[PDB]
Amino acid sequence: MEKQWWKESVVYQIYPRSFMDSNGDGIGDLRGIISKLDYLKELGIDVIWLSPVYESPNDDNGYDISDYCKIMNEFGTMEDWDELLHEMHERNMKLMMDLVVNHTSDEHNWFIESRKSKDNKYRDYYIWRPGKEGKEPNNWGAAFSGSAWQYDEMTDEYYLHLFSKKQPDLNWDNEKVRQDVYEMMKFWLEKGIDGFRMDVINFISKEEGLPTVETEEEGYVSGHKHFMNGPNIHKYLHEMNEEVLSHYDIMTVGEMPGVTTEEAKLYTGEERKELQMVFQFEHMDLDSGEGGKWDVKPCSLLTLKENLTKWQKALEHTGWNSLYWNNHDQPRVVSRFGNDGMYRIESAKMLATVLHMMKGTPYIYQGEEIGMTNVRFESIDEYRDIETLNMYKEKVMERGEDIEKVMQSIYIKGRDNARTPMQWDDQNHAGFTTGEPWITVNPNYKEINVKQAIQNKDSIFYYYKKLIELRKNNEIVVYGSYDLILENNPSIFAYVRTYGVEKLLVIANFTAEECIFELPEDISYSEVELLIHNYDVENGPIENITLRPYEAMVFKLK
Numbered sequence: 001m002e003k004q005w006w007k008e009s010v011v012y013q014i015y016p017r018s019f020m021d022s023n024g025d026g027i028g029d030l031r032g033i034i035s036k037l038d039y040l041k042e043l044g045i046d047v048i049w050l051s052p053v054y055e056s057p058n059d060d061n062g063y064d065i066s067d068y069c070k071i072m073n074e075f076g077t078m079e080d081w082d083e084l085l086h087e088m089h090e091r092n093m094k095l096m097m098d099l100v101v102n103h104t105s106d107e108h109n110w111f112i113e114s115r116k117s118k119d120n121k122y123r124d125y126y127i128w129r130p131g132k133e134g135k136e137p138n139n140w141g142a143a144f145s146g147s148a149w150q151y152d153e154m155t156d157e158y159y160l161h162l163f164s165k166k167q168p169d170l171n172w173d174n175e176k177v178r179q180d181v182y183e184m185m186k187f188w189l190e191k192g193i194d195g196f197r198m199d200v201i202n203f204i205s206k207e208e209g210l211p212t213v214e215t216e217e218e219g220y221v222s223g224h225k226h227f228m229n230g231p232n233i234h235k236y237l238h239e240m241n242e243e244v245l246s247h248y249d250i251m252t253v254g255e256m257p258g259v260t261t262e263e264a265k266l267y268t269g270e271e272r273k274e275l276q277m278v279f280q281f282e283h284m285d286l287d288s289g290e291g292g293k294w295d296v297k298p299c300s301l302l303t304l305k306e307n308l309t310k311w312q313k314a315l316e317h318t319g320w321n322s323l324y325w326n327n328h329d330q331p332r333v334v335s336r337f338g339n340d341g342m343y344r345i346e347s348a349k350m351l352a353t354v355l356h357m358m359k360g361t362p363y364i365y366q367g368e369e370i371g372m373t374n375v376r377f378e379s380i381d382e383y384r385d386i387e388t389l390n391m392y393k394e395k396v397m398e399r400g401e402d403i404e405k406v407m408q409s410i411y412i413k414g415r416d417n418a419r420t421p422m423q424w425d426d427q428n429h430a431g432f433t434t435g436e437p438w439i440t441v442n443p444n445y446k447e448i449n450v451k452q453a454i455q456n457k458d459s460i461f462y463y464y465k466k467l468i469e470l471r472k473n474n475e476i477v478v479y480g481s482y483d484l485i486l487e488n489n490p491s492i493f494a495y496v497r498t499y500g501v502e503k504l505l506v507i508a509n510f511t512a513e514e515c516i517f518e519l520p521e522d523i524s525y526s527e528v529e530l531l532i533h534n535y536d537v538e539n540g541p542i543e544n545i546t547l548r549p550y551e552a553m554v555f556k557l558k
Contacts, residue, residue, distance in 0.1 A: 006251035094194030141220030205230025268319030321360030
């Protein structure tokens with residue numbers, strides 16, 4: 001509806017632990033980020049979203065928080081943080097913090113007290129329930145394997161953890177908890193931050209009674225149907241909005257596994273007073289099968305464009321879309337949807353075109369701008385993620401599955417694909433650290449790194465930079481409507497942005513083969529201007545264009 005700064009922004013996501021190390025320990029830190037500030041400003045970034053930088057035991061690298069108001073030891077001190085905020089605000093950049101409030105670390109004070117006894121005041125800050133028969137309260141399973149219930153002898157009850165045992169879920173039906181969380185939010189808002197990325201916020205409201213999932217299965221099954229977009233989820237987000245969010249000029253985005261376009265309208269509708277946008281996973285689950293993310297399935301361009309188009313259309317008149325290809329939980333784009341071999345540069349540019357020319361706020365994950373690829377370590381010992389390691393024990397050690405197959409799904413879906421060190425140059429550890437990295441740097445850093453990309457004007461870095469510039473300088477790319485053309489073409493992803501009398505025609509070849517683009521007779525123009533292109537083209541007319549492999553181009557008509 002209304003023009004908003006956060007509607008016009010480009011966000012860059014940084015995973016602190018793998019961004020830049022400035023003190024020789026092999027783990028990235030705050031001072032390291034500060035030193036790259038000018039690099040990000042060159043790209044054209046407006047907002048920087050930092051994965052968690054709070055005090056944490058690191059069972060899930062930051063998402064298991066023991067103290068919300070202190071900086072993680074490995075990242076620095078609060079003083080390093082204050083300097084980051086200032087140096088960012090000095091430039092015209094905004095800082096968005098990750099808000100992890102569905103759960104805390106089991107080493108957080110609230111939980112320390114909570115477990116002591118049943119008549120403890122912090123007892124109902126968490127979800128404690130007695131066993132049913134001699135088993136857990138219900139049959140839900142946790143994200144990184146096993147039961148979602150952990151037994152505690154102190155009280156002879158189980159506490160709920162949708163994630164690891166060390167990440168017990170907060171009880172949001174308790175207003176003291178909500179009040180406390182709001183208190184903690186204002187603490188960071190008073191420091192001058194410009195936003196919140198909310199970790200699994202649609203998981204926050206559980207269904208009364210924590211029901212067992214009606215099933216004939218053997219072990220633990222997902223209870224997602226009973227916590228995913230819970231009975232009081234809209235009341236809590238709107239409450240949060242009245243009490244905290246509305247008081248500050250900030251931007252918000254909720255990460256929401258399982259949300260639908262219709263729920264997204266309720267979550268993001270300007271007049272609903274809840275959130276500004278959400279990260280949906282529909283496009284991230286297109287290549288997973290029946291058995292979840294590890295049950296890899298091929299994904300065609302048709303399934304992809306239909307899905308992206310659907311979200312484009314659903315939030316055209318209400319709400320606002322977020323646009324992203326990857327993050328710290330997903331494999332890298334050029335490897336997933338592109339070609340990371342012979343056409344790594346072309347396909348990376350192609351994928352950036354497709355997503356950056358749509359309606360909504362785009363998010364760039366560190367490394368995306370230089371075309372970072374997935375990693376293939378030959379041994380499970382080189383991988384670090386709880387999820388991958390736990391999945392490996394279960395499938396290989398408990399179910400007795402083939403190591404080779406298990407490793408193949410890790411190569412395709414493992415989160416570590418996204419966490420190997422940022423590749424700055426061709427020096428020892430891609431210039432990330434002078435010590436030894438917490439995780440091995442992808443061997444391809446010798447050809448794929450920031451200095452190489454910055455000295456070659458035909459690199460992915462420069463392509464992303466132009467894409468961002470176009471967006472800043474053309475209102476149509478932010479506010480224009482969206483309409484998919486050539487809907488059933490199995491090779492070409494094409495669409496039109498309309499805003500006033502102008503139009504943008506975006507054409508993308510998603511294959512390694514040459515194909516023909518035929519402009520629909522429906523579209524009529526008189527003036528044509530080539531905006532960006534990943535191949536050398538003196539294009540005109542645009543009625544019939546032969547697209548080279550992974551070729552992509554954007555035109556402004558009239």
